[PDB]
């Protein structure tokens, strides 16, 4: 909703997160095998 009155300044933003080994199960082990407790590697930033 723009108001439809005066200088309606339209403009953007973005929005941080973290992804764990649990937002993604894929950040769990491969010296043997993936989805479990006690088995952890990578994470991410993500920014909507």
């Amino acid at each position: 909703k723009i108001t439809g009155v005066g200088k309606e300044t339209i403009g953007i933003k973005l929005t941080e997160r973290i992804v764990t080994p649990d937002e993604d199960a894929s950040l769990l082990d491969q010296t043997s095998g993936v989805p479990s407790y006690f088995s952890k590697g990578a994470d991410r930033l993500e920014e909507k």
């Binding site: 769990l28 082990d29 043997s32 479990s36 407790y37 006690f38 088995s39 952890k40």
Partner: protein
């Protein structure tokens, strides 16, 4: 001794010796538990931590005449 179990890792921690665990006892017990651990499952041994709580409670007594230091 307390045991915490997870599909990934198995973690054992204890306050056996006067409320504290020593590194030497960890080394000794790691070697002993090799015969006991499951095949292909990781085993881990760690110490025990404590969290001191701070609390300032208030109590209302029906008979205020009873109150005292004791």
């Amino acid at each position: 001794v307390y045991v915490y179990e997870e599909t990934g890792h198995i973690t054992v921690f204890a306050h056996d010796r006067n409320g504290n665990l020593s590194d030497t006892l960890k080394e000794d017990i790691i070697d002993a538990l090799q015969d006991y651990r499951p095949s292909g499952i990781m085993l881990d041994v760690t110490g025990v931590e404590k969290e001191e709580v701070n609390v300032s409670a208030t109590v209302t007594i029906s008979n205020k005449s009873r109150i005292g230091d004791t």
